[PDB]
């Protein structure tokens, strides 16, 4: 009661600035920065015949 300060905690909600764990071999999650750093440099397959 009184002056009540409500944030995402007392409602058990995710923060606006929140991040999930990176995906593992058996877990689903964010894609890691170095995963993309490996992906982009990986040249696309060459289409010949």
């Amino acid at each position: 009661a009184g002056r009540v300060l409500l944030d995402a905690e007392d409602v058990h909600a995710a923060k606006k600035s929140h991040t999930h764990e990176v995906a593992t071999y058996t877990t689903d999650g964010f894609m890691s920065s170095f995963d993309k750093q490996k992906i982009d440099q990986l040249v696309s397959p060459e289409a010949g015949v």
């Binding site: 009661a1 009184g2 002056r3 009540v4 300060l5 409500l6």
Partner: protein
């Protein structure tokens, strides 16, 4: 600055107190009095009240 109760003589023998009507603009401390009132429960939620 005294509060005087007005007395009026009834028909048989008595002298009863009677009240005069006043307008809401007449009482001199009414607005401060109603301003000083505070809500019992949550006054405001996250800086906002009423229909929240």
């Amino acid at each position: 600055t005294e509060i005087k109760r007005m007395l009026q003589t009834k028909e048989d023998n008595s002298k009863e107190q009677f009240y005069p009507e006043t307008h809401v603009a007449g009482i001199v401390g009414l607005t401060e009095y109603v301003s000083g009132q505070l809500p019992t429960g949550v006054v405001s939620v996250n800086g906002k009240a009423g229909r929240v």
